[PDB]
Amino acid sequence: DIPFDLIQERTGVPSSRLKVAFARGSLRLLESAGMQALLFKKPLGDLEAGTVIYLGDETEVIRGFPKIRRTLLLSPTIQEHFRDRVAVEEKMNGYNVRIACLSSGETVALTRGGHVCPFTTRKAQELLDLSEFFREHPDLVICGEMIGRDNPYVSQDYPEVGPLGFRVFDLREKNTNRPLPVEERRALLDSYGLPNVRLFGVYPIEEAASEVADIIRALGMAGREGVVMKDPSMEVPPLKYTSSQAHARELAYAFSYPFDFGRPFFFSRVIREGFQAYELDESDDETRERARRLGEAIIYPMLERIKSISAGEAAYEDTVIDVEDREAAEEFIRHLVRLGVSATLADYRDGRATIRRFYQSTTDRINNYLKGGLY
Amino acid sequence: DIPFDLIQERTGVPSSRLKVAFARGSLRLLESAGMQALLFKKPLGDLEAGTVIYLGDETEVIRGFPKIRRTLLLSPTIQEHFRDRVAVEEKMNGYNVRIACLSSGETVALTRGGHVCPFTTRKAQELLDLSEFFREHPDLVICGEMIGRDNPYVSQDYPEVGPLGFRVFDLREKNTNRPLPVEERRALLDSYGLPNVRLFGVYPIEEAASEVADIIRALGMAGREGVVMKDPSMEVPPLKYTSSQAHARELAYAFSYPFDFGRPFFFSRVIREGFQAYELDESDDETRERARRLGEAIIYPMLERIKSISAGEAAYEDTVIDVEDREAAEEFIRHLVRLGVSATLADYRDGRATIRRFYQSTTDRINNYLKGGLY
Ligand SMILES: Nc1ncnc2c1ncn2[C@@H]1O[C@H](COP(=O)(O)OP(=O)(O)OP(=O)(O)O)[C@@H](O)[C@H]1O
Ligand SMILES: [Mg+2]
Numbered sequence: 001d002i003p004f005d006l007i008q009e010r011t012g013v014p015s016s017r018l019k020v021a022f023a024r025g026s027l028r029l030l031e032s033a034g035m036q037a038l039l040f041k042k043p044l045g046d047l048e049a050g051t052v053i054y055l056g057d058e059t060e061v062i063r064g065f066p067k068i069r070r071t072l073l074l075s076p077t078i079q080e081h082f083r084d085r086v087a088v089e090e091k092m093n094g095y096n097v098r099i100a101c102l103s104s105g106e107t108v109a110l111t112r113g114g115h116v117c118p119f120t121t122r123k124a125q126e127l128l129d130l131s132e133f134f135r136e137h138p139d140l141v142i143c144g145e146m147i148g149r150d151n152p153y154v155s156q157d158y159p160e161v162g163p164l165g166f167r168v169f170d171l172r173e174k175n176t177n178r179p180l181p182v183e184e185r186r187a188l189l190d191s192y193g194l195p196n197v198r199l200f201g202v203y204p205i206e207e208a209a210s211e212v213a214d215i216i217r218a219l220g221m222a223g224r225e226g227v228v229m230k231d232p233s234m235e236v237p238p239l240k241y242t243s244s245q246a247h248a249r250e251l252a253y254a255f256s257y258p259f260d261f262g263r264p265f266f267f268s269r270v271i272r273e274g275f276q277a278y279e280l281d282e283s284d285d286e287t288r289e290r291a292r293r294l295g296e297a298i299i300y301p302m303l304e305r306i307k308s309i310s311a312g313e314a315a316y317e318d319t320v321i322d323v324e325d326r327e328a329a330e331e332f333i334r335h336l337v338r339l340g341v342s343a344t345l346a347d348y349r350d351g352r353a354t355i356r357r358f359y360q361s362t363t364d365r366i367n368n369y370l371k372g373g374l375y
Numbered sequence: 376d377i378p379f380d381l382i383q384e385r386t387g388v389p390s391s392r393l394k395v396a397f398a399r400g401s402l403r404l405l406e407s408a409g410m411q412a413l414l415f416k417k418p419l420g421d422l423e424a425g426t427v428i429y430l431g432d433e434t435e436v437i438r439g440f441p442k443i444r445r446t447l448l449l450s451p452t453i454q455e456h457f458r459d460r461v462a463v464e465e466k467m468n469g470y471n472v473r474i475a476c477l478s479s480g481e482t483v484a485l486t487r488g489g490h491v492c493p494f495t496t497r498k499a500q501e502l503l504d505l506s507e508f509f510r511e512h513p514d515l516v517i518c519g520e521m522i523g524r525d526n527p528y529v530s531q532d533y534p535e536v537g538p539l540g541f542r543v544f545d546l547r548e549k550n551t552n553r554p555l556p557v558e559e560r561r562a563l564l565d566s567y568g569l570p571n572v573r574l575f576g577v578y579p580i581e582e583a584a585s586e587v588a589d590i591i592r593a594l595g596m597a598g599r600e601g602v603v604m605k606d607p608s609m610e611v612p613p614l615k616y617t618s619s620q621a622h623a624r625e626l627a628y629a630f631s632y633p634f635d636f637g638r639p640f641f642f643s644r645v646i647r648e649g650f651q652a653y654e655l656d657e658s659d660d661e662t663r664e665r666a667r668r669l670g671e672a673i674i675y676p677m678l679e680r681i682k683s684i685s686a687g688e689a690a691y692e693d694t695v696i697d698v699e700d701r702e703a704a705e706e707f708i709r710h711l712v713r714l715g716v717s718a719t720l721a722d723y724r725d726g727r728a729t730i731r732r733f734y735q736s737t738t739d740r741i742n743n744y745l746k747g748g749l750y
Contacts, residue, residue, distance in 0.1 A: 069749050069750065070749070070750035071749060071750060072744055072750055073744060073745070073747070075747075076745075076746070076747040077744075077747040077748075077749070079747070080746075080747030081747070081749070239749070255645075255649075258642075258646065258649075263638070263639060263642050264637070264638035264639060264641065264642065266638075266639070266641055266642050266645075267633075267637060267638035267639065267641055267642075268638075270630075270641065270673060270677075271633060271677075273673075273674060273677070274630070274633065274674065274677030274678060274680075274681055275681060275744060277674055277677070277678045278678055278681040278682060278685070287674060287675075287678065288671075290670075290674055291667065291670030291671040291673070291674045291675065292666070292667050292670055293670070294669075294670040294673055294674060295665075295666030295667050295668070295669040295670030295671075295673075296666045296670070298645055298648070298666070298669060298670075299648060299649065299652055299662065299665060299666040299669060300662075300666065302645075302646070302648075302649035302652075303649060303652045303653055303662065305649075306649055306650060306653045307653065310653075369447055369448060369452075369650065370448070371451070371455070372448075372451045372452040372454075372455030372456065373452075374444050374445070374446060374452070374456070374614070375444070375445045375446060375447055
């Protein structure tokens with residue numbers, strides 16, 4: 001049974017609160033070296049959502065990755081949040097991965113919720129040489145973005161990393177979740193042959209907002225997601241800010257399965273376009289492009305989705321991945337499913353498993369409308 | 376001391392559910408001129424929102440105007456819903472008015488929430504000649520839209536009415552809320568010289584959808600709101616269906632005050648554009664124009680609003696109305712304020728009265744960000 005007082009000491013959360021959280025947002029589950037773990041679905045105190053506690057030789061807290069705040073404007077805001085210098089990295093469109101070595105020597109890759117992903121743990125050690133880093137730094141949690149076209153979670157092709165890849169943006173200590181300063185982190189990860197997310201530079205605070213403006217113009221015309229700005233000694237939390245095309249991308253995806261994204265959502269992205277038009281457009285023409293790009297991202301995917309279902313096709317998405325065997329693919333399917341995702345194996349040849357995700361609500365509601373159902 | 380048993384007898388709503396509604400709202404007020412009345416803020420049993428019960432020499436239940444269902448498609452939805460024939464009237468973009476001659480001889484214009492508008496009651500009596508109609512039909516509630524560019528509530532130019540006119544779209548019995556048949560209701564209002572909404576015609580159900588499509592194309596090309604489809608006998612409830620410019624107009628106004636409406640306003644309207652592109656757009660040119668039209672309606676109002684607030688202006692809405700005197704103008708404001716509206720008299724020249732509406736949600740949140748406040 002759950003060692004509530006031990007956890008109370010390791011976390012700073014009173015054993016009383018923890019029993020209140022065992023009503024709802026605190027799950028006990030088997031994972032790793034026959035080990036019993038606790039997964040904080042909801043945040044609780046200093047503890048972040050996605051926090052996982054492993055109850056082994058030592059009880060290790062794998063803190064959840066912290067929510068990064070958003071800004072819609074580069075100025076005055078950057079000068080209003082930061083001090084002296086701003087480090088500016090590339091925002092990787094992928095899925096958040098915390099890699100840790102546990103007291104059992106076992107290496108584990110946590111999805112944002114704190115679940116171990118069988119696919120992510122396999123691929124993370126396949127594509128990363130972690131052995132020596134963890135021998136020397138076993139209480140540092142590698143925080144990164146799994147990216148690439150053959151990505152079961154968020155699929156964007158970053159050709160320079162291959163079909164599947166990884167990029168570290170953080171080193172955070174177990175339990176305390178304290179980050180290493182930016183430039184030390186990059187160096188340390190360099191000297192173990194580990195990949196850092198692209199860093200555009202470190203700029204004095206006066207010039208930061210303009211420097212970020214050019215980068216974003218560059219990132220947009222490349223079709224990349226955007227930027228994450230950081231206090232070089234991480235004594236100020238980060239701010240994220242994204243490109244217009246990044247917003248058209250998400251929106252276009254969202255209006256392809258419009259009834260699976262819980263309403264706004266949609267408002268939040270569009271609003272980013274208002275303030276960004278106010279700040280980055282240097283001609284009416286550009287603002288015109290911005291409008292055209294927004295309309296088309298909305299109409300055309302929704303028009304094709306509707307045509308599709310009209311022609312008998314249910315709304316689905318496929319993503320072909322590398323797996324070890326068909327059993328492995330199946331196990332990953334189950335994991336997506338216990339995450340509330342409609343998924344099945346659609347095809348399997350050698351080690352390549354076609355993961356099929358179904359969007360039931362988009363299929364149903366567009367069918368009911370096409371048959372004469374009333375809004 | 377309210378006569379709940381009487382109101383139960385006169386509405387069929389159980390006495391208990393009434394007292395429980397009143398313990399919240401449902402609200403008891405004085406109106407016209409020394410009568411006490413019951414306003415139903417939310418629906419209850421068969422009672423509609425905005426239903427008012429007048430307690431006079433007679434107990435009269437001025438029923439609220441029923442919510443009209445909407446379709447996103449003409450086909451096959453019309454023929455799944457209607458039978459035999461389909462009557463198709465213009466949907467007029469203004470505000471809802473219920474005119475009735477209460478048992479105390481006093482004529483009262485009710486807005487959708489069942490409040491007596493001092494403006495609308497004065498405007499309806501100037502505009503319409505109602506004395507001979509109500510003399511013959513005191514128990515008939517005239518239901519129509521007040522429309523025109525110089526409108527106090529929602530404003531759109533309709534040349535046919537100059538600055539401001541009225542158009543009846545329904546006749547409904549007091550208490551029962553039963554609607555007269557379409558062709559009868561129209562003949563009746565004509566013989567008494569009362570203005571009808573344009574009725575394009577009654578079509579058999581197999582031709583209804585293609586007919587409506589043609590009306591919709593003309594109405595869109597002409598900047599008109601859409602169509603309300605009716606069973607001639609009114610035995611099946613109406614379906615409203617709106618055009619794309621109705622929507623652009625709607626989303627443009629929406630994003631001039633983004634944080635005051637919704638969040639959708641946006642997903643609701645945009646979803647119409649999808650199915651309508653599907654059913655009605657015949658060339659991709661048309662769909663392209665639809666996308667661009669939708670984009671500009673979103674960015675531009677949002678953009679100007681941020682510029683407007685960056686330059687120090689509050690987010691407001693002006694509208695100019697024709698009033699009798701300035702005494703009239705200030706009564707109308709006192710009226711808007713007692714309904715929760717942040718309005719003032721911006722200006723008054725020669726019977727004209729600039730009514731200014733403030734939207735502080737939009738002003739505050741847009742200023743919070745321009746000050747460098749985090750998303
Ligand atoms: N260079 C980077 N630095 C930090 N985070 C990054 C970087 N590149 C990608 N990310 C990922 O982007 C996330 C923030 O971007 P996004 O808005 O897509 O995530 P989110 O789901 O909104 O996360 P949250 O709201 O919890 O911050 C981070 O949580 C991280 O997973
Ligand atoms: Mg209307």
